[PDB]
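Ops channel
N.P.: pipeline sanity check, posting one input/output pair.
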């Protein structure tokens, strides 16, 4: 029965926290309030293990994620939208009724701001007006940001502004408080009273500030659209300045995350917007004193939604907003390589192509999706199942591979590229598709379309069980939990760390040819590509385990039993699948797609420097690309991931999402609405 040390920054907030403490003492977990001066003091308290959680604004949730605080957003607020209650709000600009000045005429006016560092009050409006050339701030060599704002505006009320005095001229109160972040004219509703009393011509607030402050006088104010029109206050869909992320509940990244959210689940369920108590956790909104509103939680919010455990401050705000805040403070492809083997092939690509391709080594393929969403890496090549999880993350494929003919990728008006998913067993083994429940299994990795998605999607259609370690006896699927039966048959890397059941090239049973090595050594069935039997047999694989392997040592498994020869994969397979793809962010789609063709013309199967380096040769290990790849054909512009896979493959990958979503899929499903 522990307690959560909450930290509040204002005295009115301390009274609401203490009234929250008296109502939660009966519960199993409880609360303790820590009075502090500013938000920077509460962040130093949580990193010092003195406090636990604060509801910060997006511009301040950026500040918590920096070292050494390294705090993490664990809960977000939910605002009301008529499309659906998502976790974002709009930044608008409110002016008086019937006045003449447009958005270009804001030079020399008087403004009211929410606070120095807030999203809707400072980052968005100043970010826009400096991007539109109105404010003059080439960089930090000019000086502070607010020195340019004091030169731009005549006078204003910026709570928390220290160096400049024009930003404190319009604030109400005695000198000691007028500038502080808890002044009367601070916050979303406090800056609106700067407008209503006449200290400013424009107030930079969120979209629903006018509705809760002046409910019946809504027509006495106008929103300042970026074209120059004074649209009314109910037109923020057409007049917003940006759409910014919600206010986030930051905390440490430790065991204390789980007991905080269970407390927030307890308090919201009893003190939400539909509660019957006199106490409300959110508001309730209405005409009140400006310092009495927005205490510990904004009055516009209606619920709290949990942030997934993989998010941080960078991936919460999005790329376009984090790049804006990073700007005010202060031809080459960045490939993502997984493991030591792909990194040792990629540095070879870097030196033969002279620096135009550079790469960062990671440990798993889900790290490539995050470093590309962060923009720290450019491109990566993913299997068909990982294209779906990168497509829901916001990335799009731009190029794909051909296996059938090098000539066909020229005439792009042709059949779509594809391969096949088969099940390979040993010769004299009597195992077929029916009695597969008691047998062992060998996959290529969990989540990939060849070994995991097609076979488990057939099984999930067969038995309807979302348990998939249970359906087999044991096996080796790289990336599955180490303490489960789908990791015991994994041989591991054999190095200093056992590295058992890891989803990189260190594992001996990882990959297309790796799952075949699991079949011959210790296994009963291998779920792999249609041609991996052909590539390894015939004396081509110089590995000791495959020294004398031949094509007749294996027999494919049809769906209706019916063990058939490996050369007839057109008839005896599980499902047709799309090929691998290179997924990237939509912004940099045009830059690499013509650049990757310049790399392929030098290093392809008809490349000029294939004596120097071959892009599509990997010594039967599939390093950065498969070895069946002949040429890369460009995917047309605007092709989304739902169009690239096709509705045939999109049906099974959508249904298999419901059983066990991964952590990389869970945070991206949070990012794109629900
Ligand atoms: Fe694949």
């Amino acid at each position: 029965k522990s307690v959560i040390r909450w930290c509040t920054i204002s005295s009115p907030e301390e009274k609401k926290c203490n009234n929250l403490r008296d109502l939660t003492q009966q519960e199993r977990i409880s609360l303790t309030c820590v009075q502090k001066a500013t938000y920077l003091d509460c962040i130093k308290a949580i990193a010092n293990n003195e406090a636990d959680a604060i509801s910060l604004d997006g511009g301040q949730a950026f500040e918590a994620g920096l070292a050494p605080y390294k705090l993490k957003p664990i809960a977000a607020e939910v605002y009301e939208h008529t499309e659906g209650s998502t976790t974002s709000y709009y930044a608008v600009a409110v002016v008086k009724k019937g006045t003449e000045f447009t958005v270009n005429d804001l030079q020399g006016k008087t403004s009211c701001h929410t606070g120095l560092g807030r999203s809707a009050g400072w980052n968005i409006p100043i970010g826009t007006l400096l991007h539109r050339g109105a404010i003059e701030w080439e960089g930090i060599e000019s000086g502070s940001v607010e020195q340019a704002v004091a030169k731009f505006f005549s006078a204003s009320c910026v709570p928390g502004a220290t160096i400049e005095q024009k930003l404190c001229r319009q604030c109400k109160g005695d000198p000691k408080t007028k500038c502080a972040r808890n002044a009367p004219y601070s916050g979303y509703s406090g800056a609106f009273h700067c407008l209503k009393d006449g200290k400013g011509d424009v107030a930079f607030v969120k979209h629903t500030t006018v509705n809760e402050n002046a409910p019946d006088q809504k027509d006495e104010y106008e929103l300042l659209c970026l074209d120059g029109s004074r649209q009314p206050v109910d037109n923020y869909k057409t007049c917003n300045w940006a759409r910014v992320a919600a206010h986030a509940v930051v905390a440490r990244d430790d065991n204390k995350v789980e007991d905080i959210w269970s407390f927030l689940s307890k308090a919201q369920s009893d003190f939400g917007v539909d509660t019957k108590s006199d106490f409300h956790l959110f508001g309730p909104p209405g005409k009140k004193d400006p310092v009495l509103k927005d205490l510990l939680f904004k009055d516009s919010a209606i619920m709290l939604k949990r942030v997934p455990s993989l998010m941080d401050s960078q991936l919460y705000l999005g790329f376009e907003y984090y790049s804006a805040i990073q700007s005010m403070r202060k031809n080459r492809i960045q490939w993502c390589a997984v493991g030591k083997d792909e990194k040792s092939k990629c540095d070879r690509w870097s030196v033969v192509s002279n620096g135009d391709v550079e790469c960062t080594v990671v440990d798993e393929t889900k790290d490539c999706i995050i470093k590309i969403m962060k923009g720290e890496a450019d491109a990566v090549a993913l299997d068909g199942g990982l294209v779906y999880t990168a497509g829901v993350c916001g990335l799009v494929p731009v190029m794909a591979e051909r296996y059938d003919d090098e000539s066909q990728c020229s005439k792009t008006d042709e059949r779509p590229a594809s391969y096949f998913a088969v099940a390979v067993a040993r010769k004299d083994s009597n195992v077929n598709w029916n009695n597969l429940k008691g047998k062992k299994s060998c996959h290529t990795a969990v989540g990939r379309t060849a070994g995991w998605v097609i076979p488990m999607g057939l099984i999930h259609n067969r038995t309807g069980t979302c348990n998939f370690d249970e359906y087999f006896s044991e096996g080796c699927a790289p990336g599955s939990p180490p303490n489960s039966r789908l990791c015991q048959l994994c041989q591991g890397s054999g190095g200093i760390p056992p590295e058992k059941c890891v989803a990189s090239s260190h594992e001996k049973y990882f990959g297309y040819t790796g799952a075949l090595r699991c079949l011959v050594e210790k296994g009963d069935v291998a779920f792999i590509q249609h041609s991996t039997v052909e590539e390894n047999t015939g004396g081509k694989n110089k590995a000791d385990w495959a020294k004398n392997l031949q094509m007749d040592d294996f027999e494919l498994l049809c769906t209706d039993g019916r063990r058939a020869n490996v050369m007839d994969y057109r008839e005896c397979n599980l499902a047709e699948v799309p090929t691998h793809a290179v997924v990237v962010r939509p912004e940099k789609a045009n830059k690499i797609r013509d650049l990757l063709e310049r790399q392929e013309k030098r290093f392809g199967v008809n490349g000029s420097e294939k004596s120097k380096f071959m892009m599509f040769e990997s010594q039967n290990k599939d390093l950065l690309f498969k070895d069946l790849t002949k040429c890369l054909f460009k995917v047309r512009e605007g092709t989304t991931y739902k169009e690239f896979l096709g509705d045939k493959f999109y049906t099974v990958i959508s249904s298999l999402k419901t059983c066990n979503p991964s952590d990389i899929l869970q945070m991206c499903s949070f990012l794109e609405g629900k």
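N.P.: looks fine end to end. The longest helix spans residues 256-271.
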